[PDB]
């Protein structure tokens, strides 16, 4: 099998920005766009595999959607609401992911929306200037309120009175104001001393429980409950000081608080807030004078967030489960039992680009996953009982992950390259931090590889294979695995040496070993593939077909049906058209001049913008895939010249591809949608790229 989407990350600071419906379904704001997740039964998952799936996407928005409401109007839950910082309030209906209508009233950057409990159309907006529109959306009315020249953290409509709304402001201000009167404040609720994050009413009317009662959550680390008859705090709690537990987090990264709440309808005399380092506390309100609290998976470790959580979103399962959905600034989305207080389960996202897949050949399915957040990903993609089994990996890196390639025989060991040049090699079976190599590239990391060393670490007085890393300036070097802090090898000087060459030497884009380990292919800038021979780097074949920049050669692998088959290279360059050699004659001829090939074994087009990357599929004879930008994955019979499938998941322009090791239908891909995409070739009805 089934498709899988490891999604970009909840957005961060918004006081709304996902929410959630009985059955059920959960909705989150990550980038442009809101990602779905049934949740429950109607996931469809395997007995205690965790019963969600990502299951569609709204897009539409063109910058930042700042919040996210759906309709709680029984018969209407597919109905919802987004803001975004493109200055449009829109209404989508999730069974057809479109837009219903929409409106472009605020004229400054909206902070927050909600979608009315009490009128089935209704939502309410708040902009950072102050500015308030009612918009009744299903009637093409709506009302501008202009309450108090303060900057609007976070709106909550009352869910017993149709009329009232809370605000609170970044300053501390809340107010309750009645929207039948134009917006007049009816309670002025003075307390906090800094920005409020969120605000719940008591899910039972009346002061008698535990008028009614309201709670606010700020970062002045107080949680006040009001009485909105009197306009009075009747209980402050404060945010105890815990000690830290789980993973040790970076301590490098800003960290303050954010204080949202939940107030639960099965349990009106109790409260749920976030925490600092994102743990969930249940308030008993009861006590409430004495403060009693009770820690989310209190006896459980290794559950709890590790940095501040954003929004809580309740949500009642169709097999009767009291569930509540956590995102954090630490990019898991969690799904908390609030009957148990234990995680149910664990949704990981990613916050930037997929710039590299890599499959370990050591253990198969572990897949490390080069992000543009700074953090290197290993998905355990064939755990039995979790569909995002995926560890993170953050000492040492600190820049975005370019290239990664696992060692092909040590366990745990996983080169990764970055943008700012840095070569580091990971041990991902220990807690250690990875090694960095005293030599950087000038230029961003594009491809690391492991091959034979070849002088002169060769003649020194190591280890069985060296680690070669390619530059976007157009040095390879060679690195010693076991001499990381000393020094690296720019191989130029023995390709010249050895080919006594007097020219300037090509710029490298691209490097790939052959599966044998006795052939080193470069791509350059200036589109040519040149074919080297071990020890030495002897020069035997260049290959003059792409007119641009190389950016990706793969050879094919040796468990085919023929052996003749692993001589077959693909290759792409920032042209769309994909070719393949052949290269069986000129590597076993071995020749003392070197062979010039000008015309292809053969051609795969269809893409209509630049290739990023092409892989074999290791359970056919000459099956390739490739990623381009044009936003497309392209399946391909390579021997035939003949297109397959199209995948068109991703909404950005593709960076990596890679076969699942023991799937023949199943291909993972990642673009600079913030996404990577397990998807099965037999599902895809399209057979060629959009012209
Ligand atoms: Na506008
Ligand atoms: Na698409």
Sequence with gaps: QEPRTLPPSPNWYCARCSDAVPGGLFGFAARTSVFLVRVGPGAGESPGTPPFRVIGELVGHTERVSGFTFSHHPGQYNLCATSSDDGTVKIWDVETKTVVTEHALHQHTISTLHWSPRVKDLIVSGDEKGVVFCYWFNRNDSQHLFIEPRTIFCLTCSPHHEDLVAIGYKDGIVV?????????????????????????WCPLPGEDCLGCYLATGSKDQTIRIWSCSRGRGVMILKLPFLKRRGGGIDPTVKERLWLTLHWPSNQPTQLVSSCFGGELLQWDLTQSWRRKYTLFSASSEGQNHSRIVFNLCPLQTEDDKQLLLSTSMDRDVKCWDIATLECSWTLPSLGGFAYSL?????DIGSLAIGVGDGMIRVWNTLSIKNNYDVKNFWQGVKSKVTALCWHPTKEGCLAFGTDDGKVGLYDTYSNKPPQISSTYHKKTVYTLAWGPPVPPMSLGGRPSLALYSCGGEGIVLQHNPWKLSGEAFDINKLIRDTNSIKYKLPVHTEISWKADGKIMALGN???????????????????????????????????????????????????????????????????????????????????????????????????????????????????????????????????????????????????????????????????????
């Design 176 to 200: 309750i104001i009645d929207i039948s009167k134009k917006g007049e404040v009816i309670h002025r609720l003075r307390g906090h001393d800094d920005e409020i994050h969120s605000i719940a």
């Design 358 to 362: 890599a499959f370990s050949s050591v």
């Design 525 to 691: 800038e200036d589109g040519s593939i040149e074919i080297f021979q071990i020890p030495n780097l002897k020069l035997i074949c260049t290959i003059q077909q792409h007119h641009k920049l190389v950016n990706t050669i793969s050879w094919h692998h040796e468990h085919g049906s023929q052996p003749e088959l692993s001589y077959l290279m693909a290759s792409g360059s920032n042209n769309a058209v994909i070719y393949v050699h052949n290269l069986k004659t000129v590597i076993e001829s071995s020749p003392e001049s070197p062979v010039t090939i000008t015309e292809p074994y053969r051609t795969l087009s269809g893409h209509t913008a630049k290739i990023t990357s092409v892989a074999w599929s290791p359970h056919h004879d000459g099956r390739l895939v490739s990623a381009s930008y044009d936003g497309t994955a392209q399946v391909w019979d390579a021997l035939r010249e003949e297109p397959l499938c199209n995948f068109r998941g991703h909404q950005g322009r593709l960076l990596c591809v890679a076969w699942s090791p023991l799937d023949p239908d199943c291909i993972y891909s990642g673009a600079d949608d913030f996404c990577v995409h397990k998807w099965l070739t037999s599902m895809q009805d399209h057979s060629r790229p959009p012209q």
